Swiss-Prot record, chain A:
Protein name (record): 26S proteasome non-ATPase regulatory subunit 8
Function noted in UniProt: Component of the 26S proteasome, a multiprotein complex involved in the ATP-dependent degradation of ubiquitinated proteins. This complex plays a key role in the maintenance of protein homeostasis by removing misfolded or damaged proteins, which could impair cellular functions, and by removing proteins whose functions are no longer required. Therefore, the proteasome participates in numerous cellular processes, including cell cycle progression, apoptosis, or DNA damage repair.
Family: Belongs to the proteasome subunit S14 family.
Subunit structure and binding partners: Component of the 19S proteasome regulatory particle complex. The 26S proteasome consists of a 20S core particle (CP) and two 19S regulatory subunits (RP). The regulatory particle is made of a lid composed of 9 subunits including PSMD8, a base containing 6 ATPases and few additional components. Interacts with DDI2. Interacts with TASOR.
Gene name tied to this protein: PSMD8
UniProtKB/Swiss-Prot annotation, chain B:
Gene from which the chain derives: PSMD7
Name of protein: 26S proteasome non-ATPase regulatory subunit 7
Residues of the full protein shown: 131 to 260 of 324
Family per similarity comment: Belongs to the peptidase M67A family.
Described function: Component of the 26S proteasome, a multiprotein complex involved in the ATP-dependent degradation of ubiquitinated proteins. This complex plays a key role in the maintenance of protein homeostasis by removing misfolded or damaged proteins, which could impair cellular functions, and by removing proteins whose functions are no longer required. Therefore, the proteasome participates in numerous cellular processes, including cell cycle progression, apoptosis, or DNA damage repair.
Organism: Homo sapiens
Extra information: Does not bind a metal ion.
In-chain residues carrying the UniProt-annotated modification N6-acetyllysine: K74, K84
Cross-linked residues, Glycyl lysine isopeptide (Lys-Gly) (interchain with G-Cter in ubiquitin): K50
UniProtKB/Swiss-Prot annotation, chain C:
Gene name of the record: PSMD13
Coiled coil stretches, renumbered: none
Domain of life: Eukaryota
Whole-protein residues included: 283 to 376 of 376
Complex and partners: Component of the 19S proteasome regulatory particle complex. The 26S proteasome consists of a 20S core particle (CP) and two 19S regulatory subunits (RP). The regulatory particle is made of a lid composed of 9 subunits including PSMD13, a base containing 6 ATPases and few additional components.
Family: Belongs to the proteasome subunit S11 family.
Modified residue annotations for N6-acetyllysine: K16
Chain's role: Component of the 26S proteasome, a multiprotein complex involved in the ATP-dependent degradation of ubiquitinated proteins. This complex plays a key role in the maintenance of protein homeostasis by removing misfolded or damaged proteins, which could impair cellular functions, and by removing proteins whose functions are no longer required. Therefore, the proteasome participates in numerous cellular processes, including cell cycle progression, apoptosis, or DNA damage repair.
Protein name, entry field: 26S proteasome non-ATPase regulatory subunit 13
Length: 50, 130, 94
């Protein structure tokens, strides 16, 4: 009941649980957008009169 | 937005198609220059509009926005020409197609490999001193 | 033939496709390089080669539709990227 209730397909006598979950590949693009937003803001509130 | 002058010189072209020798223009790079006896007059006359939003203000305008607008106009021009080849005009040469294939081959490799690591290093160093 | 994402290939593939024995293939590619029609490098320890540039060739009136297709949505990307920086920094200078 546990086996067919949770995971660990017991095929070749092996009970395996997925415990790697690396994901997050080389993804410079999301930086390439949000970091540009960020730097534009730095330069925004740097020379404007306070 | 642009620059008011272009420069051309005359040359003779051979051909690989066996077409006879052609007499045709060739491009030369150009610029505006100045003399101290004139820029005094130019500046006395340049009372028309704002300028010189100093330092960080002038960088991004002068070298991001007015860059991208130009690059866009160029790609629109290529875009238009590749219509006429829809039977509107004869393929002017395989030359122009070879050049286009070089363009789309050269453009930088997908930003997907360990290039990424090398990029993060410099961004850290660039910001720390800030 | 291969898409620009790869343009990398092993000895066996050429050896079969040109039906020449594997031990010759090195000299073949070296010849190819030396006459100057193709550029890249060879990585013999694992039997692979990389080929970064190749002679242009003529092509037909339907293949160029691919060129126009790629170029169009490359073009739209520039305008999209311009809108952002022209907007978010509006107050520094519009």
């Amino acid at each position: 009941d546990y086996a067919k209730k949770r995971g660990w397909v017991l095929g070749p006598n092996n009970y395996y649980s997925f415990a790697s979950q690396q994901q997050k590949p080389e993804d410079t693009t999301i930086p390439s957008t949000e970091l540009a937003k960020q730097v534009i803001e730095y330069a925004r509130q740097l020379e404007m009169i306070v | 937005l642009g620059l008011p002058t272009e420069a051309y010189i005359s040359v003779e072209e051979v051909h690989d198609d066996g077409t006879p020798t052609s007499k045709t223009f060739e491009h030369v790079t150009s610029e505006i220059g100045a003399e101290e006896a004139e820029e005094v007059g130019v500046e006395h006359l340049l009372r028309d509009i704002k300028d010189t939003t100093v330092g960080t203000l002038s960088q991004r305008i002068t070298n991001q926005v007015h860059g991208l607008k130009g690059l866009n106009s160029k790609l629109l021009d290529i875009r238009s020409y590749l219509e006429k080849v829809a039977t509107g005009k004869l393929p002017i040469n395989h030359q122009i197609i070879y050049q286009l294939q070089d363009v789309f081959n050269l453009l930088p490799d997908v930003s997907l490999q360990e290039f990424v690591k090398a990029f993060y290093l410099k961004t850290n160093d660039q910001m720390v001193v800030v | 033939t291969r898409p620009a994402n790869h343009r990398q290939l092993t000895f066996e593939e050429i050896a079969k496709s040109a039906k020449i024995t594997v031990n010759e293939v090195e000299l073949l590619v070296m010849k190819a390089l030396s006459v100057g029609l193709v550029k890249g490098s060879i990585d013999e320890v694992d039997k692979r080669v990389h080929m970064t540039w190749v002679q242009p060739r003529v092509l037909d009136l339907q293949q160029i539709k691919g060129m126009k297709d790629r170029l169009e949505f490359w073009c739209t990307d520039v305008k999209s990227m311009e809108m952002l920086v022209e907007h978010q920094a509006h107050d520094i200078l519009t």
